[PDB]
């Protein structure tokens, strides 16, 4: 079993519960130093692209840790070389936030937290023909990281919401664990074009939640998509599972890891993409 | 369904033939530069040692590929760290040779082929309960590469054979595929005083057999073991399996990968290690 709060099940023991990997030396998340970082010119822009055939239905649930949108079987891709030939499949996005506004991203940018982190994970599909075989087998994953700030004068319409449509109302009180709601698809390529998607940085990694896979390609967005306080607030009405010690969900973040732990074996580079200037 | 020499099933098809993971671009083995390299001051020297109370017994395979020896469970380990608390545990090693005494070594040191190469390979014992649940899974595996050079003048107890016991003499032609014979233990320990155990290329890479798995935590000695003409001609009497062009075992290495092919998503970096001086 595992918690963000609760202190016998939380973060700081999933070392010990998990070691395999979570007391590794490639975990994730880490700080994203600009000045650290080396610019690699090689990076191309990020696109995510539909399969306008795919009918299929979203779902999201709260499974008691993070509000998770199930997307359905070969419809969104992610594409890092300008090529749609499917390399990358995408399986779901979840979302880390905080209690209060000045914290809730996994990562942190040069120390600063945004208030929700969304994690949009994907499949090497060139590789593995199934999320099932990706998930736990080497080089299996790509997650994006979309940071979000809130400002107080926007239009819906420019909001990170316009693309998620709402969610179609399901985060609320009522929407307990481990409760899954059909929703309508999310525009995850507009919600892309909401931010520079040639500017991120870019890491060999982990997943963030136990057993802290390190098969992860990171790519984190630097410019955050734009949310108001009323569309954080309604994540923070989701109930927490039975074995947190919080009753509502927040600070559903981990901790930051190290680049490099002292007890590394290969050290790892951040790397740094922008626009070809 | 691979081989070395067979153009049918041969190094230049596994890309096709095991996407999962012999197409990818964190391959094994590398050409070793000296100057392409980064000197990491915080890697120190490798120690192999026995659990003494270990009795059973090695074998050694003719698997049709290589000569592999395979060493009872719980019996020998590598650290990385100084302390002996069996992070690592050794499963096998096995060898790879040329036709001549020109090449033979998977790995190259700035462009130079050895005659012969060991590869000791241990799984992360630190993370992962058995070796069969660490071949596949993310970071499980370390392998240790020796390099043998050949010497005209040298007494057998000072040549690499010595540490080996000979093979208990298990090395002729009727050593065929897939026969295994039990051996005299192997002195690891004897093995790495050869050598200089602190002088060493670091990387992050694969096995170097299909499918080519992207989870090896490299480390190539660059001090050469000393062995004899006599000594490297008693694995070339072996057979190769029948999927081989080939009749005797030779050239049962893969070519060089590169460190970062260009479809790279995130570069390695090549470490090398020099003792505390
Ligand atoms: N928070 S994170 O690092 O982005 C992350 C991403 C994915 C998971 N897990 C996941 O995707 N699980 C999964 C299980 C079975 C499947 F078939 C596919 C995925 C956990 C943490
Ligand atoms: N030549 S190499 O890169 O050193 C290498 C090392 C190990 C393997 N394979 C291996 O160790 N297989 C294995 C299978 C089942 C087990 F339980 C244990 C090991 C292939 C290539
Ligand atoms: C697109 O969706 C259709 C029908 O849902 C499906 O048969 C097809 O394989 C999908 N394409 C890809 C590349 O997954
Ligand atoms: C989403 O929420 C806002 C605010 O209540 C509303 O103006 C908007 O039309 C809603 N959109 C959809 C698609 O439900
Ligand atoms: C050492 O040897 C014996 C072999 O029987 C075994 O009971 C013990 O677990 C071994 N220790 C390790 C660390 O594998
Ligand atoms: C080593 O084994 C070979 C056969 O593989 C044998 O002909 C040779 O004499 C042996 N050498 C020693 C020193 O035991
Ligand atoms: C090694 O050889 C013996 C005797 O022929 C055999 O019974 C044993 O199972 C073999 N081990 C293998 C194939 O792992
Ligand atoms: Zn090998």
Not at 133 to 139: H, Q, S, T
Not at 186 to 210: K, Q, V
Request: aromatic share 12%; net charge neutral; hydrophobic share 35%.
């Amino acid at each position: 079993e595992w918690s963000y709060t609760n202190i016998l099940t939380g973060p700081e023991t999933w070392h010990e519960h998990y070691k395999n990997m979570c007391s590794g030396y490639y975990q994730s998340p880490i700080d994203l130093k600009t000045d650290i970082s080396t610019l690699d010119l090689k990076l191309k822009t990020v696109i995510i692209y539909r399969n306008t055939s795919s009918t299929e239905t979203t779902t999201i649930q709260n499974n008691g840790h993070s509000a998770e949108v199930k997307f359905p079987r070969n419809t969104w891709f992610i594409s890092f070389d300008g090529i749609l030939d499917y390399k990358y499949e995408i399986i779901q996005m979840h979302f880390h936030w905080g209690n209060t506004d000045d914290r809730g991203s996994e990562h942190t940018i040069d120390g600063f937290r945004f208030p929700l982190e969304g994690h949009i994970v994907s499949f090497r599909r060139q590789m593995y023909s199934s999320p099932s075989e990706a998930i736990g087998r080497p080089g299996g994953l790509a997650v994006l990281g979309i940071m979000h700030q809130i400002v107080e004068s926007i239009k819906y319409e420019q909001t990170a919401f316009k693309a998620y449509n709402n969610f179609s109302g399901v985060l609320n009180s009522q929407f307990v664990p481990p409760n899954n709601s059909t929703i309508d698809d999310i525009n995850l390529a507009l919600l892309l074009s909401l931010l520079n998607p040639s500017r991120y940085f870019r890491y060999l990694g982990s997943l963030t939640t136990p057993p802290c896979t390190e098969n992860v390609l990171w790519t984190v967005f630097i410019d955050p998509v734009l949310i108001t306080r009323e569309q954080i607030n309604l994540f923070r009405n989701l109930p927490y599972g039975s074995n947190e010690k919080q009753t509502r969900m927040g600070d559903n973040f981990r901790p930051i890891q190290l680049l490099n732990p002292i007890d590394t074996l290969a050290s790892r580079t951040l790397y740094r993409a922008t626009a070809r200037g």
